[PDB]
Amino acid sequence: LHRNSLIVLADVALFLALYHFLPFEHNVVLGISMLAFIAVLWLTEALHVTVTAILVPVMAVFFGIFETQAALNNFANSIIFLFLGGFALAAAMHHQGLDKVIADKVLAMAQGKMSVAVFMLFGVTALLSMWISNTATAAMMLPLVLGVLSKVDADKQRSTYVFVLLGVAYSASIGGIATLVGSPPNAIAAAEVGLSFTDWMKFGLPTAMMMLPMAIAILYFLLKPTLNGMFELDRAPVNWDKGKVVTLGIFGLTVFLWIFSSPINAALGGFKSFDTLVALGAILMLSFARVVHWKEIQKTADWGVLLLFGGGLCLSNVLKQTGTSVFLANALSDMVSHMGIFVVILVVATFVVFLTEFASNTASAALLIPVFATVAEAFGMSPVLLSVLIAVAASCAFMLPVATPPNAIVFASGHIKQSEMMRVGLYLNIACIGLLTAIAMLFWQ
Amino acid sequence: LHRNSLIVLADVALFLALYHFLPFEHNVVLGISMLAFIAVLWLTEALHVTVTAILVPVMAVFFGIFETQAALNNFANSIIFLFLGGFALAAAMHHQGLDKVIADKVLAMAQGKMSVAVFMLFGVTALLSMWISNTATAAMMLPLVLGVLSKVDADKQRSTYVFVLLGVAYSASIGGIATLVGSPPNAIAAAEVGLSFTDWMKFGLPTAMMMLPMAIAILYFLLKPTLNGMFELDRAPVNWDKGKVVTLGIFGLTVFLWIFSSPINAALGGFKSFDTLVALGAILMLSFARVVHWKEIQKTADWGVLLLFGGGLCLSNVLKQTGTSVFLANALSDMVSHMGIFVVILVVATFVVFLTEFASNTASAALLIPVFATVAEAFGMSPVLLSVLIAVAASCAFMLPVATPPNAIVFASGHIKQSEMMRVGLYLNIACIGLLTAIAMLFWQ
């Protein structure tokens, strides 16, 4: 007796209508009907996206596509455990106060001036969300801006809060674009096409360090904050201790292995998923050093996202087995030939941004990469390009906080203006699309 | 600089010593060394058992036994999602207050007399832990006994608390013996040998309904509580509401499918893991009815146990591939022939009970079933028998609460006597061993 339940029932009706009123082959029609069913559920949020991910194997099995174990085996792909290692590092830092220490040392780097402390905050948020996550990285940095701006006349000068708030909220999202960890869509792209950490970083890091300064510029030239005073916090300086240095060293070692995985993996025997093995080894070393415990890790890690990966992967395998992907590519050849690759990528990224406005970034990614990339497999036209393009565009979200939990946390202070944030996000969306397409045209050809 | 770290290093030393000072084949020596390594870690609790489970695939891969994905695929076995569905049902009941309602209706069944309310409490705990878990089932029932016994002179008459406390603590553990859900060891046994819900229930339910009355008798004839008065609670009677009835119907439907899975699965096409599919469908129906949400499920479900299943399964597959199991069975043939099956099962169950005293029940099970059952595979001598015997014995634990979280919760009231509980557990252990072996000799032959 709820709109969500009505959505599910109408969605079942659409599934049946497609099943019995489509003049295609049995496997392709089945896959298209499943894709529509799951698409509506993920976009409309009638059920939780994790629950829909759990539903994908069940309907896949009951239609005789996969065996139960084969369908469920996509919930233990190596990328899932890679993100698990990322969450473990996050738990270690939040448990040891290392993120607070990093912010305090940065803020000691800036003597007392706001005009650059915010910039170092954005940069630190990028470097930190690169390896961890977005929502976590926003939570601890919000109290900092409140303390810094507690003496700035918060009744007529609120754009300064808005700058030092949205810059962090978007810096985390852009920091997720440089490394596989930090943003679930990037993992999904790597999962479908097959990607190493270093190669994906060569594709992502330039985009991150070029997108982020642009976004900061957009805000600064749109809204005009002061950034001319001085701040003098009253809080005490936290200093180094055992555990903090050890987990810092483990973090550096893990990054070093993830970067030089190809030579190391070649020397050690050439294992298939050395990045994931490094993630698990990081968990083992943290447990060995007793810097964190599994209950912290269990409380911190979002297992719903890890199951949503399984949903996306099972959907991709379903579309691959059923032939829907090649059927779609063959039907879309005429459109992709008439319209150049330039306009093709413009419409794809534009559609992604308008899609995550009224949807979840990760759910939309898990819906989209299996379609276009498998389509791009048949086309030729390296699907790594489209996969990363969609994955990065998913992280670029600048809409009403219901779209994005980071925006929810940062909005929750309760003084930011709805319409102003919409217009700011509009300009940011436009700039991201243009810059992304320029990168793909010039660098990736 | 901790005893746990010293244990890990000495454990590495034992691994290397076995590697280079054992005159067996390379694969069998490798598997034995891994088994010793993991055994010590799980028993000594140097690291968390979940962390050790994560370690098993890493060392398996780095020694060239499995590919990374093949090793990790044991973390998504269908049994794991079966237990996930159990946790989802638990979340629904704790969210809707249904367990409180069940206890209140039972306590309305008993007008005001303690002499049978405790017995219905033990029985309800059995029927409830059959489908859910142990620790959860203990938590809500402890306040009940406090309220009932708040007027019983808790300075000289404490054995009444002890009866109404340990009976529940052990009723949950025994309730886990009748169904696959409720106790992780039973899932591990089903996983290795291959077992359906109904068949395992034919093996387990008689044992549960025969073990539980015996245990209650042991306590009643050892310690003498009064159970002759009347209680008059002051709390209000909670009544039925929407959601409670719906999740009750879903629980009944899920049980009905799990029982009549074989005919239904035969009719529907004969799917491989219809029990797991029923579990997932239960999650879907709960989400569809909006009686529970994924954040309740995520907070409730213990993902460490689900990963520990993957550790046990990967260890079993490692021992199977390496030939350690058949090597062990061939070396132990002379002992198993000289000593009859009767004495073999007596020593096995006796060793299990003395093992879980200073260890975790589930970790010990994940250590033991892969050894004996795969050994029993080669012997003949149906390994279902040994697997279930070890799995049920693991649930039978009556030792210091550090062994068992249910005992931790029930002890935490702080008036129970250490030595008395040890002696009570000793007699209970003895009776469980004897009765279990009688069942295996007579019924299972």
Short mmCIF file of C-alpha atoms in Angstrom, two decimals, chain A residues 12-22:
data_model
loop_
_atom_site.label_atom_id
_atom_site.label_comp_id
_atom_site.label_asym_id
_atom_site.label_seq_id
_atom_site.Cartn_x
_atom_site.Cartn_y
_atom_site.Cartn_z
CA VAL A 12 6.55 -6.54 -13.06
CA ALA A 13 3.91 -5.53 -15.61
CA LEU A 14 6.58 -3.95 -17.82
CA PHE A 15 8.69 -7.10 -17.51
CA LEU A 16 5.82 -9.34 -18.64
CA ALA A 17 4.85 -6.95 -21.44
CA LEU A 18 8.40 -6.99 -22.79
CA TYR A 19 8.51 -10.78 -22.44
CA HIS A 20 5.38 -11.49 -24.50
CA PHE A 21 5.41 -8.46 -26.86
CA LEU A 22 8.96 -8.37 -28.24
#
